[PDB]
Design a binder for this molecule. Structure first.
Ligand SMILES: Nc1ncnc2c1ncn2[C@@H]1O[C@H](COP(=O)(O)OP(=O)(O)OP(=O)(O)O)[C@@H](O)[C@H]1O
Ligand SMILES: Nc1ncnc2c1ncn2[C@@H]1O[C@H](COP(=O)(O)OP(=O)(O)O)[C@@H](O)[C@H]1O
Ligand SMILES: [Mg+2]
Lengths: 49, 548
């Protein structure tokens, strides 16, 4: 239902970037631009697969 | 074309049926397998319009009838599961080849051909070869001969409606269709406790009596198959059930009433003398619970795509702790009604379902007894909800297996539903999309079950577009071997997982694994310790602009 999708995407990006030294703050930028792309996928008449 | 006969000879259907029935008569003083069938017919075809009705149980009862007569029986029951389209005679030929070439198995043997539902274009040629022409032939190999004295039974589910009437046919029906014109119980199942004890409680629940008197005297109470069938039809909710759902309901009620009897709550009611009226609420809420679990319900996707219910639906869950002696309540809340009772609601909206359940003195007793009633799991910490789970699942001394798994209320409703589904005996099949988290969910369940042991518990089996059945039986067999090893050395139960298990033509063999507990004709061990969970992709059409 996309309420927990921003939770799941942020957990995946924080678990798989391995950001021990990348950025303390830009991981939220990566997470919500991925969620924005996911919402643009959902706000459209179809998806690919 | 010039040698054409414009006559088209034909015979009536009763003449052909009487011809085949008269020439299938195995005579007397032959010591055949046909003496338990319809007066020595030696070939039968069991069919129905819908599945889940009792073909294989009829075959099993005929098999045990042949066990009963003709002592020192030791009879085999060869099962050949035909499971692929474009039907192959060499598969059933190679299944039958090492059987009757030994000449000590010329004692009467029941043979049981099982033809599945995905065999679309190979049926009447094989039927006419085996049952009429009495041969299976390989071009470069040996020739099989059907013998007058080995009983054959060929299943078929339901063109073929005209073709399958020639052979001596015995039909079978759902319990709705044999309660109006015709017992209906399997009499070894009614004598079994699994259909006796839920009947033993529903008999006293139907007409109103107090359940303070103890039951389960370990023997059968005076009842009939027909009135028990009437009770189980009026207490199930759905109007046209198969025999699968009615048995599922009975085992579910057996498991919850055994969890109720294993607690000391009846003993506490005996020693306190003001707790009664509890078991009426117990059996009423288990009727609601079983309606939640085992009661579902494009023109060619209508039996598949039409999902009657989703997870966006209230599932009031109740569970009884085995070792510890309290209860729990997940998924619903209790609020005061103005008629002097308490109704049940789901969170985030207002629904006034299941009115007029029970009285106030039971609330006084359970408020005295300090049970966890009416708690909303939105504002609990991680250790408290994992302690609620370890009380719920029976797990002692909990260790948190993964803090990265965020446990919402849906992700614990799914845990509880899945674990009791493979606890009581229902087959577990998941209808879900790709994006939903099922592998991570069952991994969290397996990690919570094993706790800290480094043994292998969850084994993912990937099912792809070109998965032959043979590797599926090999993987299920090695899962059995590691299940025996794990329960032998660690006292731990394993989980076998089938992911996207809907692409192959071996989905019938996938059904064969868990719905009836038999692999390649060999019975799976109930005391081995093994849970098979499968997942299927949903059925839906693409958009028309996508096709454009
Ligand atoms: N007459 C009956 N009385 C009691 N239980 C029955 C009866 N018929 C079937 N069952 C129950 O139905 C369950 C499964 O039925 P079964 O395997 O015989 O179905 P089926 O007709 O072979 O199905 P399918 O076509 O899907 O292979 C078993 O648990 C069995 O006890
Ligand atoms: N409780 C949870 N917390 C965080 N992420 C989750 C949770 N449940 C599922 N997921 C996510 O689901 C995704 C699994 O993707 P996928 O392989 O499609 O799952 P499945 O194999 O179950 O279909 C993972 O990225 C994982 O982050
Ligand atoms: Mg069958």
């Amino acid at each position: 239902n996309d309420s927990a999708e921003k939770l799941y995407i942020q957990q995946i990006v924080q678990r798989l970037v391995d950001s021990v030294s990348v950025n303390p703050s830009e991981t939220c930028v990566i997470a919500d631009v991925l969620s924005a792309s996911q919402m643009f996928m959902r706000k459209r008449e179809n998806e690919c697969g | 074309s010039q040698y054409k006969v414009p006559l088209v000879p034909q015979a009536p259907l009763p003449n052909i049926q009487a011809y085949l029935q008269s020439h299938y008569q195995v005579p007397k003083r032959l010591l055949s397998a046909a003496t338990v069938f319809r007066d020595g017919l030696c070939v039968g075809i069991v069919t129905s319009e819908r599945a889940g009705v009792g073909k294989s149980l009829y075959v099993n009862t005929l098999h045990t009838k042949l066990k009963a007569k003709l002592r020192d029986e030791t009879v085999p029951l060869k099962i050949i599961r035909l499971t692929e389209p474009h039907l192959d005679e060499n598969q059933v030929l190679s299944a039958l080849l090492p059987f009757l070439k030994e000449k000590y198995q010329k004692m009467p043997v029941i043979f049981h051909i099982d033809i599945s539902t995905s065999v679309q274009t190979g049926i009447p040629i094989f039927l006419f070869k085996l049952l009429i022409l009495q041969y299976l032939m390989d071009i470069n190999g040996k020739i099989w001969r059907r013998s007058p004295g080995h009983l054959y039974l060929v299943e078929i589910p339901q063109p073929l409606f005209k073709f399958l009437d020639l052979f001596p046919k015995v039909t079978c029906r759902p319990p709705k269709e044999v309660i109006d014109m015709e017992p209906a119980m399997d009499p070894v199942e009614f004598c079994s406790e699994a259909f006796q004890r839920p009947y033993q409680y529903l008999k006293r629940f139907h007409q109103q009596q107090n359940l303070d008197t103890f039951q389960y005297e370990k023997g059968s109470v005076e009842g009939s198959p027909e009135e028990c069938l009437q009770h189980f039809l009026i207490y199930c909710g759905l109007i046209n059930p198969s025999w699968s759902e009615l048995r599922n309901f009975a085992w579910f009620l057996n498991c919850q009433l055994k969890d109720c009897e294993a607690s000391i709550f009846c003993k506490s009611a005996f020693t306190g003398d003001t707790l009664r009226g509890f078991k009426n609420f117990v059996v009423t809420f288990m009727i609601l619970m079983a309606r939640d679990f085992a009661t579902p319900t494009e023109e060619d996707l209508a039996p598949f795509s039409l999902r009657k219910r989703w997870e966006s639906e209230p599932h009031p869950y109740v569970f009884f702790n085995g070792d510890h002696m309290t209860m729990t309540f997940i998924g619903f809340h209790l609020e005061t009604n103005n008629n002097g009772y308490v109704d049940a609601i789901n969170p985030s909206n207002g629904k006034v379902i299941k009115k007029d359940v029970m009285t106030k003195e039971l609330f006084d007793g359970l408020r005295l007894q300090r049970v966890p009633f009416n708690i909303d799991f939105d504002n609990l910490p991680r250790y408290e909800k994992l302690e609620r789970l370890c009380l719920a699942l029976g797990i002692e001394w909990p260790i948190d297996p993964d803090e990265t798994y965020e446990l919402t209320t849906d992700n614990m409703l799914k845990i509880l539903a899945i674990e009791m589904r493979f606890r009581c005996g229902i087959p577990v099949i998941i209808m879900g999309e790709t994006g939903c988290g099922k592998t991570r969910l069952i991994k969290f369940l397996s990690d919570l079950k094993r706790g800290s042991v480094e043994a292998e518990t969850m084994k993912l089996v990937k099912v792809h577009g070109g998965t032959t059945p043979s590797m599926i039986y090999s993987k299920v067999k090695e899962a059995e071997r590691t299940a025996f090893s794990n329960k032998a050395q660690h006292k731990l139960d394993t989980i076998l997982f089938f992911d996207e298990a809907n692409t192959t033509e071996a989905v019938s063999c996938i059904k064969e694994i868990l719905c009836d507990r038999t692999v390649d004709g060999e019975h799976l061990h109930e005391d081995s310790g093994l849970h098979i969970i499968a997942a299927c992709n949903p059925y839906r059409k693409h958009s028309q602009e996508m096709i454009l």
